[model samples]
Target chain A: VNFPNIPAEGVQFRLRARDTGYVIYSRTENPPLVWQYNGPPYDDQLFTLIYGTGPRKNLYAIKSVPNGRVLFSRTSASPYVGNIAGDGTYNDNWFQFIQDDNDPNSFRIYNLASDTVLYSRTTADPKFGNFTGAKYDDQLWHFELV
Target chain B: VNFPNIPAEGVQFRLRARDTGYVIYSRTENPPLVWQYNGPPYDDQLFTLIYGTGPRKNLYAIKSVPNGRVLFSRTSASPYVGNIAGDGTYNDNWFQFIQDDNDPNSFRIYNLASDTVLYSRTTADPKFGNFTGAKYDDQLWHFELV
Candidate 1:
């Protein structure tokens, strides 16, 4: 299952927040993620949006370019998005990227399992959010090629 | 005001921490700095170590490649390193780069104004430190060309 918006063969790209123009980054040498300054994305900010050809064909997975880690959440029914390390292949879950009709250039990426969109809050420890809605700029994302 | 360790005319480079292997970065779209993962180094992580030609010769200033903001400290005798916003050139203070005799490859960047070194402590907020000493890797820096 493939959409024109979703790139196949694990092409590298970046997730830019539609609001602040900041890009998602691997916050530390560890696996935490954060929205950082918009720059010529380094490996810390470079990622591959893998279109799933697996059991969940339509959804996608956000994986890092430098290391093989994949973004996921394993906490409560409500979770904080983080990444899986060491053989992150099997650990990552499916993600949904729904293109926004209001703004054709933007999309909202969410976790299918958690039913939560990938949202970024610009507050203290704004590393990740609980996935807010209502078309806020922090929740809207742009898929940019590397 | 020029040393082979620092590039002239403000050549862009990344400051890699000797201990953690993390590179210093402009933490947000706004200024604050942090030590992040070792990547190809984006603009947020890229900087120019400017050798001072003015009042403080032999000292240097860490200026951002993107917005031209420079790192400094504004508190008491002991200060926490941050940066300037408007016309950062006028606001940035002088920094001293003392190459470690034990490790020529590593350097310590300290604020000449506050007598503090650029250090990254791996703790809660690990964004900036008050400049520690005693040959700890956290305080050692490496000027790498971008």
Candidate 2:
């Protein structure tokens, strides 16, 4: 059972891995997994793979850009963060960044599925090497998971 | 597009920018950054990267750890000392970690994309010493994106 904190109280909720039967969170209270997670984990977190964060924050392998532009993860160009969204409508397939209650220093949870709460973490300590503070919102999102 | 930070507050902003739209925060702001970004030439304050913090905390990814487990960023992964930064899940398509507020002695941002903050900075320095005691919780969660 992997359960990460929300950095502080009342920040948000998320789940890490896929639980088998009756997965539950003590905080939210409401049972039956009444939520659906969308998007990906925090882009700058080390759990990019599980939570689908960082540059490759999308499970679909897409790197979206500004001004209604996007790129697929399986790119053959110099910059992997290339390729435009196939759908062209930007209807879905994006992750939303959120706070990690346990460790406020880093972004942890992401909304990939839709509205489910997913909590994720790693076994090793992550390092702060370099960072890029991007703006958040519907247009300027970072990553999402499935 | 749903920008981060409170729309009522002035605009979403950034400071000490390494990237064009990205900035290294140094303080806290009202209404928050992740909600609605005010826009352009923001205040220079080392605020919290709730959704996109770099990995310099020497902490592990939240998904890989067990429920209720405690792991310090600086002290985690003995011998390695927070060597693992970016997501190991993907090889090429991924982001790395960074220093908090550009201060090496301070906390670390795991990757570049984790800076999508809701409570954007407001020239208010991190009074708590930049992630001195951040921790995650233990509770399995389910994820899905919309």
Candidate 3:
């Protein structure tokens, strides 16, 4: 998919999994947890893309507009995405989109500082996972415009 | 004037003062700081819009891509624009852009929570200050996509 012209600030959209019908989802928590939903996309399933700085130039903070929490990886120990306070710092909120070489429409959301990518090992669980490598389909996602 | 359209993430642009030729800029220091520079836009004058949530739905975190900091207001007492860490949460990094009613091309970048807007009392220092109201041209800005 050559990437659509980077999305505008106010546009609402969904990040769907190319391998599964699941979409990236965030739940309400002190450290919001990121997961996937198999059903149709709804309010909690939606995300608003936030832009960040260099190396992170094409980077973004995938945020939940309604919950007001940003999707972030708290540390290298946990590769999973969590909703955390928007402290306006880099590591906590910035992520870059890299197109998967195998699939043009698919891409990996990479966290440079932690060197992790968002992934889900199983479709049975609602929770999402972050891993060190991008060798699986769970690590790749597709952008869906709302 | 009617919001030109929320700019796409990764898109570099300038936030030019509505009536003046100045543009929003950030400088390196113990902590990076934000100000307006006269004349044409350059790398320092450039910003990439990052989207956020809630009342911040139409809100954006105008960031200096070069320095990796967002245009921030240090505290409630001092509403001056400065560069702070991009923690991905509000307060330290979220801003709302409201198109000025009088001038369609003009808009006000409001820092909520603090209930103040970006303002500059003078143009000599290149530094920017914030106030409780948006009655001045300093508070009004024009979004110039680059």
Candidate 4:
């Protein structure tokens, strides 16, 4: 089937917090955490979309630019997220940016496990959460092709 | 900024040996040297074009898919070409696809540091050289956007 709003695999792009209009970035350190960043995106803020195959079909991996680390959600039922060096084998690395039903221009990033959704509440930290509960403007996240 | 036939920064594409009709591949080992494969392209054969900036502007790094390693020519004036873990800062990891003065569809790959051009020959492994002596169907190459 067709995955709308999902950029082609190998396309370099960025995710942004709709409310704050900041770029999603990987805070590199022990267990690199994914956060939202203000202003323009640099190396840490860049990512590449990798389309999956077979059982992974319809899913995508947000690989850190140059690092080859894919987005991983290690925390369960929690709001935090991490980026890890994983191939397409890790289920935690696979996610779907489903086309937002109500807001055509918007999208939501969901973790396959824990059924958690990624969101941000505007922090200089740009720290995104794998939300387990429904909340306010946190649902306003979308894609920005580079 | 306009690389003409060059694909986007994150687009995965294959370089074909214009003479042998083989896909250029990364033979991964302690050192990964690029070679020409005889059949359908696989992971080792797939690559992405990472655009450069500043002094590296207009140049591109051929990164192995999911590997993050960019192409490298380590043999000095004449050495084995490799795909090593790179962040595009190494001059040996950068190259440009000069539009072929012959077929508008064909191009040439040259290492920024070694100045060796990638070429292929039947019954030969992949090679980078400066055999301007002529009779080199091996020099020219083309792209196949995956």
DockQ metric, candidate 1: 0.01
Name the 10 consecutive residues with the lowest summed lDDT in model 4 chain A.
A73-82
lDDT of 4 at A15: 86
Stretches off by above 4 angstroms in model 2 are: A1-54, A57-109, A112-146, B1-129, B132-146
**lDDT for position B107 in model 2:** 26
Which is the leading candidate under DockQ? 2
Model 3: per-residue Cα lDDT over B1-146, one tens digit each: 12556688779888877666677778676333566667755687888878764323445787787887777764454435677657445454676565664566677776544545676545455346666632567678777888
DockQ of each: 0.01, 0.05, 0.02, 0.01
Could you report the Cα RMSD, in angstroms, for every candidate shown?
21.9, 19.7, 15.8, 17.6
C-alpha positional error of residue A12 in candidate 1 after TM-score superposition, expressed in Å: 1.3
Write out the backbone clash pairs for model 1. none
What digit string (tens of lDDT, one per residue) describes model 2 on residues A1-146? Answer: 01222222222222223222111121112332122233444321111122333333322212222222322211122222122334322212333344433333334223222212223222222110111232122111122122
What is the C-alpha lDDT profile of model 2 across B1-146, one tens digit per residue?
11112112122322222222233222223322212123554433222121222321112222111121111122122221111223333222122222332233222322222221111134453311122223211000111110
lDDT of 2 at B134: 31
lDDT of 4 by residue, A2-94 (tens): 225677767887888778787778756744366666776588777888876543444578888867788876464333577767665566777
lDDT scores for all predictions?
0.61, 0.24, 0.65, 0.65
The TM-scores, one per candidate, come to 0.43, 0.21, 0.45, 0.45
